[PDB]
Amino acid sequence: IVEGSDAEIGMSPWQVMLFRKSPQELLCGASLISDRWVLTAAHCLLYPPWDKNFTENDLLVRIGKHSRTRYERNIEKISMLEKIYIHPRYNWRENLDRDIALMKLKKPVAFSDYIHPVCLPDRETAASLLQAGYKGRVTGWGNLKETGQPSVLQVVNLPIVERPVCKDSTRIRITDNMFCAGYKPDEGKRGDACEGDSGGPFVMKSPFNNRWYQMGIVSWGEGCDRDGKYGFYTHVFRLKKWIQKVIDQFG
């Protein structure tokens, strides 16, 4: 996260770290959506241009974390993966369209002060909240700059951007399965996701019921926090039929 700040303890209890077993390193962010299911970006698991194609046994999920590198004894919980599910129409060839994946845990994780699931939006939530100017919150342990790494989880609040402005900021083909967020050059403030934040959540707190909803997944950007660029996020509600299909069939 570029130009963010340290998270408060328990601020993002749905935050998940995807952790590579060997070599031991941060692979991506992710989020807890139930005691057995974790949501992330497809490109965290499958991205052939970078020779990335992880299997279940390659990875661990670490839940309840705050420190990036510490083993947070008595606080974090580490889970093995039973199965990965990547959206069947995930477009890794072109523009990361439908950049979404689910991971089922081998065993349910126990909730605690530090571990708790985020809500997924329904149609009404999304209609009400996914509007230009409305701010969401992005969290992760990724790079602090495009070109170093944080001691603890970072957080940044960013406004959703008008679709034509998103489109005009890039040569990449944008789709309805994406939205973009970030400040404009004229706005002064800044902030963005970066390498390592991929797969983490973009959340919004509904003013109607005071619950946190995951509206987006950290997906892509041209650099990190560049003037005139924006971060792009997978539109969770648009892909919710798939999420529900997978959980209903395999849960």
Partner: peptide
């Protein structure tokens, strides 16, 4: 989950985090 999106150390105890108000103010 019936309890999704309500944080044990915040919403559950009616405490607010340091920047959630910034989000609320944007929801016009």
């Amino acid at each position: 989950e019936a309890d999704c999106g309500l944080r044990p150390l915040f919403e559950k105890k009616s405490l607010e985090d340091k920047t959630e108000r910034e989000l609320l103010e944007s929801y016009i």
